[PDB]
Design a binder for this molecule. Sequence first.
Ligand SMILES: *[C@@H]1O[C@H](CO)[C@@H](O[C@@H]2O[C@H](CO)[C@@H](O)[C@H](O)[C@H]2NC(C)=O)[C@H](O)[C@H]1NC(C)=O
Ligand SMILES: *[C@@H]1O[C@H](CO)[C@@H](O[C@@H]2O[C@H](CO)[C@@H](O)[C@H](O)[C@H]2NC(C)=O)[C@H](O)[C@H]1NC(C)=O
Ligand SMILES: *[C@@H]1O[C@H](CO)[C@@H](O[C@@H]2O[C@H](CO)[C@@H](O)[C@H](O)[C@H]2NC(C)=O)[C@H](O)[C@H]1NC(C)=O
Ligand SMILES: *[C@@H]1O[C@H](CO)[C@@H](O)[C@H](O)[C@H]1NC(C)=O
Ligand SMILES: *[C@@H]1O[C@H](CO)[C@@H](O)[C@H](O)[C@H]1NC(C)=O
Ligand SMILES: *[C@@H]1O[C@H](CO)[C@@H](O)[C@H](O)[C@H]1NC(C)=O
Ligand SMILES: *[C@@H]1O[C@H](CO)[C@@H](O)[C@H](O)[C@H]1NC(C)=O
Ligand SMILES: *[C@@H]1O[C@H](CO)[C@@H](O)[C@H](O)[C@H]1NC(C)=O
Ligand SMILES: *[C@@H]1O[C@H](CO)[C@@H](O)[C@H](O)[C@H]1NC(C)=O
Ligand SMILES: *[C@@H]1O[C@H](CO)[C@@H](O)[C@H](O)[C@H]1NC(C)=O
Ligand SMILES: *[C@@H]1O[C@H](CO)[C@@H](O)[C@H](O)[C@H]1NC(C)=O
Lengths: 147, 726, 49
Amino acid sequence: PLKYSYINKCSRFLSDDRTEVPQLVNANQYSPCVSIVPSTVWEDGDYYRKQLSPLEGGGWLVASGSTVAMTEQLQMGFGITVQYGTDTNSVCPKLEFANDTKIASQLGNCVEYSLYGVSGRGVFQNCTAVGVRQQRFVYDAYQNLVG
Amino acid sequence: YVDVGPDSVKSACIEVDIQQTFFDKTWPRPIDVSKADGIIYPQGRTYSNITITYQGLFPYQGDHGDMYVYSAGHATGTTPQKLFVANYSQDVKQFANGFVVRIGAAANSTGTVIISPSTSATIRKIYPAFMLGSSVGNFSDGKMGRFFNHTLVLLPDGCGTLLRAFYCILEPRSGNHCPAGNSYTSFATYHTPATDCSDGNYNRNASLNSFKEYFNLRNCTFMYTYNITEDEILEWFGITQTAQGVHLFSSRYVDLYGGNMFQFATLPVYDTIKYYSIIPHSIRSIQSDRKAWAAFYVYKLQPLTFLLDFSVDGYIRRAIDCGFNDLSQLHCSYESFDVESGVYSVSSFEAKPSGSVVEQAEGVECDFSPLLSGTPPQVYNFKRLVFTNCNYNLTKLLSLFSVNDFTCSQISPAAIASNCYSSLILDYFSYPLSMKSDLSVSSAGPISQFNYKQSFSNPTCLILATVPHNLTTITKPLKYSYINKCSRFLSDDRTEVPQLVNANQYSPCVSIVPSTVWEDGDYYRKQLSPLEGGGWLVASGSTVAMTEQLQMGFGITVQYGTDTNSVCPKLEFANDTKIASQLGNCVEYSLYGVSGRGVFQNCTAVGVRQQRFVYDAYQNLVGYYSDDGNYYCLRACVSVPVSVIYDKETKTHATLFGSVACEHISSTMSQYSRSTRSMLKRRDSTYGPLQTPVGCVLGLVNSSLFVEDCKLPLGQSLCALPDTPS
Amino acid sequence: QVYNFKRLVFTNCNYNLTKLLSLFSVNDFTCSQISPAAIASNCYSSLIL
Ligand SMILES: *[C@@H]1O[C@H](CO)[C@@H](O[C@@H]2O[C@H](CO)[C@@H](O)[C@H](O)[C@H]2NC(C)=O)[C@H](O)[C@H]1NC(C)=O
Ligand SMILES: *[C@@H]1O[C@H](CO)[C@@H](O[C@@H]2O[C@H](CO)[C@@H](O)[C@H](O)[C@H]2NC(C)=O)[C@H](O)[C@H]1NC(C)=O
Ligand SMILES: *[C@@H]1O[C@H](CO)[C@@H](O[C@@H]2O[C@H](CO)[C@@H](O)[C@H](O)[C@H]2NC(C)=O)[C@H](O)[C@H]1NC(C)=O
Ligand SMILES: *[C@@H]1O[C@H](CO)[C@@H](O)[C@H](O)[C@H]1NC(C)=O
Ligand SMILES: *[C@@H]1O[C@H](CO)[C@@H](O)[C@H](O)[C@H]1NC(C)=O
Ligand SMILES: *[C@@H]1O[C@H](CO)[C@@H](O)[C@H](O)[C@H]1NC(C)=O
Ligand SMILES: *[C@@H]1O[C@H](CO)[C@@H](O)[C@H](O)[C@H]1NC(C)=O
Ligand SMILES: *[C@@H]1O[C@H](CO)[C@@H](O)[C@H](O)[C@H]1NC(C)=O
Ligand SMILES: *[C@@H]1O[C@H](CO)[C@@H](O)[C@H](O)[C@H]1NC(C)=O
Ligand SMILES: *[C@@H]1O[C@H](CO)[C@@H](O)[C@H](O)[C@H]1NC(C)=O
Ligand SMILES: *[C@@H]1O[C@H](CO)[C@@H](O)[C@H](O)[C@H]1NC(C)=O
């Protein structure tokens, strides 16, 4: 980027032009003020305003931003999060299964396991097939895997 | 970007006539929660026949939904004419934690054409279209629902066997009857069955192209398609949004028969949805070829708790909305669909609150002129202003400076501005912003070690700010200065006693330190008096360069009280229209900034007079003196206890309101308990309330029978008989 | 820019994040509710960056 930049203001002016209320960003979501802010901030302290319609509840959207000088090598940041699902846990590290043994039946002992990233320890048995298909995991009222 | 295919052959569109009065119908469809209608299956797990409670987004049991019906447009004779559609294009709704819909439930039945209802045509399922996005606004003709940026588009295309979805930018068209044209009425889409959906060649692009005739796609970033096959059976569908993106659900893929939702698909879009609307559509079919279509419905979702009856086959078959009734509350508490017969307690009524009155005031604007001129103090020299009896508007003060640091411990900053107090105290000082890293109310920096501290017994706030170029009556210190040490030497010349500053007090070392520190690292000493046991006062300090604009800080604390609360925000009492002496049964109130709710009564005037309020041994307000010379007593307000008689043998119930008596009873309650009490009304809509010696009851019937044991005694001699066995 | 975020999500897939990490020089790596090593070895319904 020409300069690194960010929004340092995002609030709505009350229609009576005195009172004002801030609009803090929602976790994991874009702030609403992005609708008026330019893709980069052209100059430090740049600001913009939008009149708001009675459909919008009135007032003026107000926003501003600030900048930081560019560098010879780009500097970057990342955010990383993960989500644990139940039958959707298909994201994994590449498998190390090569040069091992056939799985998973042993029957056998109550062997440690992971299925689609769901860890546990236990023994398996030939069973019927209660409800319901394609949910993969089955649980009791006590939050213990049943099968 | 996405290969949506070619732009429309013309910018022109078919004219749209609004025929909405033809479409007004009353065909409500309340949710059969007992049938698990509209239930979304839990994510990723399944169960045996055990019943478990669960929490998630769900429809309300009593919701009748919103109804929309698609219909044929105008055609006459053997050919198509102009569209005749509903005004649904104007129905913008806020997104509200998703929704679910009912599609085709009226299949294999007959109804009417609606636009030409005399035909009495048989009805068949038709699939809905929608648009979602973060903003809406006026069309250049002032029409409702124009959209901004990119929006979700969901449309069946041609026959229902194909479903499409997109994320793209719409563009208005200047053709006649189109959004940038000035002949525009309202947007609509259409299908033309005469050639569309040929049996050997279904027209997969039919609906998209009619959409394209009113808008030009730009920047399409996503597209999806899905495979569907025809089946007139009812299907459920819905939408939710999470930080993982939008999710789509349907009953068709897994539980076509039972209707349980499953997550059929997901979407990559992470833009938050703020608005939702239904896309209007019409059939271009020939006037003798018209076909009526089955009704379509929509239902809102909310994060409600439900009992769920899983089938041994893993389908949810029954569910209980816990908040639907007091009866439902009982089932949820016992985690079952069969509570043992008995009398049971249920939650009480809130007793019907009403609008506020206040007895605050009075006073004059708090003079804040000491801050408007001269040089502010060094960190150990603080100025203080005590404010009592006066009115304020702190935002007026905020306009005078640029604030570079705002923080408030133990109180929101909005509240401290709006709160009324026994006192308001402001400390103010010069402060370079180079030192702002060392200052917070909890900071370990030398500024707080030796120059200033605040008590935490009272809520506090802090402000750092600088002077605007038009505030030059305020002036700069030669240098900013601070004490970076304060201790006293012991008289024996081997040890030293540190002296951290006390909260809300000047450091003792100020008595020797100069009004400014002449040089960085300067130190000073004074011999201690013999009354102090001798030894030497010691202090040292440091400086910071002067800056182009003066930099300053503020400390704010407030003091709580009752009849001493004469410091308040400026107030306006117009159109209350009355305050104390106006009753009332439950009203909100504030007296001198003391909040509460209750009812007042004209009474005596126990002492001590003029002491403001009056309290019991448990610190609850008892009553209050007023400037009308009248003592008011306060009873707070009185809640109504509730209980329920339940007869599982006949599956019937009845209720008791306790000691409250039927004189405060009304057919509906604003007081309030649970969203409905209609289950009682199933018999009691037709009868008056009945007073009993214990209390007023509903649906009891005064039989005057004498029975030795009801197994449902109401206490005293009261006894509710079960109706006779089946 | 920080108000312009780009997001990647991953489902159904296999990874070796240390090979990804080799492409940049990291001067700050921290995490919460997970060790920085375990986030690479744990399996998930999604991975979000
Ligand atoms: C389902 O749960 C019930 C618990 O109530 C188990 O008990 C049987 O339920 C059926 C259906 O109500 C009755 O007809 C039987 O008489 C019940 N058995 C007994 C001993 O009371 C039932 O075993 C469970 N089913 C499965 C497949 O686990
Ligand atoms: C599922 O949908 C896809 C497209 O969304 C279908 O794919 C093509 O469908 C046309 C329609 O006649 C065929 O002529 C093509 O040969 C199909 N392409 C293929 C099979 O690669 C597909 O037919 C649908 N149904 C399925 C997979 O059962
Ligand atoms: C009316 O439509 C319903 C679906 O809306 C039909 O229900 C299906 O009918 C078939 C044919 O007998 C059954 O095998 C299925 O079990 C039914 N349910 C499905 C597919 O979910 C019903 O038969 C139709 N009735 C008439 C008279 O046409
Ligand atoms: C998004 O919408 C806002 C108004 O809703 C508009 O000002 C902004 O330019 C849009 N962003 C685009 C078109 O990239
Ligand atoms: C335009 O938007 C405003 C904002 O609420 C709305 O009240 C009005 O009905 C719309 N149409 C016209 C023609 O002003
Ligand atoms: C037990 O498992 C085998 C395979 O391990 C399977 O073929 C069989 O169907 C199962 N038993 C029953 C009763 O289904
Ligand atoms: C037509 O649109 C209006 C919105 O202006 C809506 O309130 C009304 O319910 C619609 N239907 C009618 C008048 O039948
Ligand atoms: C969208 O189209 C516009 C046309 O002006 C172009 O500037 C932009 O790069 C496109 N964005 C894509 C293809 O993501
Ligand atoms: C004079 O001053 C010091 C204490 O400040 C002490 O030496 C002496 O006792 C004082 N004189 C009298 C009479 O107290
Ligand atoms: C009611 O209050 C007024 C003063 O506001 C007083 O004159 C009057 O005696 C009071 N009445 C009773 C019954 O206490
Ligand atoms: C109910 O019936 C008894 C029987 O004598 C009668 O005395 C009483 O007045 C009736 N009504 C009420 C409200 O109890």
